[PDB]
Design a binder for this molecule. Structure first.
Ligand SMILES: O=C(NCc1cccnc1)N1CCc2c(F)cccc21
Ligand SMILES: O=C(NCc1cccnc1)N1CCc2c(F)cccc21
Ligand code: NA
Lengths: 303, 301
């Protein structure tokens, strides 16, 4: 029993984190085989950061301008190149701890674990979701840039996020490992803002299914509803539309609990309309939307 | 900025988790140097659990009755002994991945990371506190027993918890790594029940100091309180007493924010009286009590 915001074990990723220094900028890099991946902004100064021309700044640098430290050991950079907003530093040593891995791009609503690091040294792990507005609600200070997000899908690490920046509202923006930003953000100091966010409906329902599995049942009712009527209600409360695809994905949890998705939607309707009336669900007074259906099945049945 | 329930990186502990089997019972063990630590109830059957006599069950076992598996590899058990409610299995190979570590017994209110495991293989990592009633609110299924709690300050892993059992209310009980239970719990399936829980007042205050640090001030007020009047009110909402020790511990966060501990206490009183009126603090609609003063200084600024 019990239901907790749970990260993947971070050990396979810990053994890939290095420190990358360029001039006075120090930040974190990801060492896989003989390449170190990090945010290209490592090459910028303050002034540069206002309106950087990355191509131009990069061509001015030698390999030996990049100092890469794996624990105590320096790695020799033998090559450098850019892909979108990430810098790829070729090094002379392949990482002996390289796990089986892929680079994947995740969709808004999907969750991942973040290993937060400072000076190439991992300090913390937490669970996040990609918000509909393509930000993440992370916990990051100066020095965190180049920290990464991942899922573990078997023994295979799927890298999905690299941290680049904080927005003025204190949320976080970054790229996939091919250097493409999530969201309409750029790596320069101009005015940027998170767009207005929405609640991830399918995740809230998943968490309601988790609560029932853990014995928390007071919000169930005798009512059912249609997709359309529900979606009318979702839109009103700044919830994402729910699709048939979502309904399909919740199938397992529906079968296990005997609550049809549209039945559970009737529950969520009521919560949105009436509130919680002083009650909690799994110890929360708000509806949690950072657990996927997969997350719930993984934690409430298996390893 | 941001504020998250954040666990320690789990890799130093992952390299220590093994599977321990006795008869038909399989659970998790912790391999440090040439010893594997696990719950002694691994030697119990169906019948045993009501009134097990561990000494009598154990004397009947040989080394080779204990199967220990580290990933693919079997370890040879060359010794066994019991300490309190943990079994120590001596093995023929020292764990080459053994981190620098110590065993520490924690007080209620302290937080730690849990690495949940099944079959000696890690499943997830999350953050917990020792509740005042000596339980933890974990996430644990059958087979999780022998999973461990830890902190990593510096490069040294401090092991503080091993999981033994689930109580009827769905909360969790276990031991330090010397096999002493937290609280009055025993490794017998008799009727035992968690004491009524209280909120960890010092932690809530710490978290209010965190919300100030991250720019959030709406809950402050112009009032102060005595320690004693604070405690008289706190107890009526099932909050733990706050001691002078707690006040001393909050000193640094007081200095950093310019808000005296008893002024923050005044704020908490009002929050308890009023609730939040549709507002949140660091993204919560409840008062969070699973971040220590140390945790707040670690994560913030
Ligand atoms: O925000 C930061 N860096 C430090 C930091 C602090 C806390 C959390 N994350 C990151 N940066 C660097 C790069 C950058 C831009 F290009 C555009 C806006 C912001 C930023
Ligand atoms: O409850 C369990 N084991 C299963 C379990 C389930 C969910 C989470 N953790 C563990 N046990 C084993 C040992 C024991 C006692 F001695 C006294 C009461 C209970 C238990
Ligand atoms: Na219903």
């Amino acid at each position: 029993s019990g239901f907790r915001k749970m990260a993947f074990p971070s050990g396979k990723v810990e053994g890939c984190m290095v420190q990358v220094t360029c001039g006075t900028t120090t930040l974190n890099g990801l060492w896989l085989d003989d390449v170190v991946y990090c945010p290209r902004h490592v090459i910028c100064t303050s002034e540069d950061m206002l309106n950087p021309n990355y191509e131009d700044l990069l061509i001015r640098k030698s390999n030996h301008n990049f100092l890469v430290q794996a624990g105590n050991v320096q790695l020799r950079v033998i090559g450098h190149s850019m892909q979108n907003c990430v810098l790829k530093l070729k090094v002379d040593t392949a990482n002996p701890k390289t796990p089986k891995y892929k680079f994947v791009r995740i969709q808004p609503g999907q969750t991942f674990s973040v290993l937060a690091c400072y000076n190439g040294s991992p300090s913390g792990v937490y669970q996040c979701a990609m918000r509909p507005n393509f930000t993440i609600k992370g916990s990051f200070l100066n020095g965190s840039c180049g920290s990464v997000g991942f899922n573990i899908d078997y023994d295979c690490v799927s890298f999905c996020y690299m941290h680049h920046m904080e927005l003025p509202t204190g949320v976080h923006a970054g790229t996939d490992l091919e250097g493409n930003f999530y969201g309409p953000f750029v790596d320069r100091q101009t005015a940027q803002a998170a767009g207005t966010d929405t609640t991830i409906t399918v995740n809230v329902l998943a968490w309601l299914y988790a609560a029932v599995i853990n014995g928390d049942r007071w919000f169930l009712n005798r009512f059912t509803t249609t997709l359309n009527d529900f979606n009318l209600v979702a839109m009103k409360y700044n919830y994402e539309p729910l699709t048939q695809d979502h309904v399909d994905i919740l199938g397992p949890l529906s079968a296990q609990t005997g609550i049809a998705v549209l039945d559970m939607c009737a529950s969520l309707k009521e919560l949105l309309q009436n509130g919680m009336n002083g009650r909690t669900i799994l110890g929360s007074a708000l509806l949690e939307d950072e657990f996927t259906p997969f997350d719930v099945v993984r934690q409430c049945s298996g390893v």
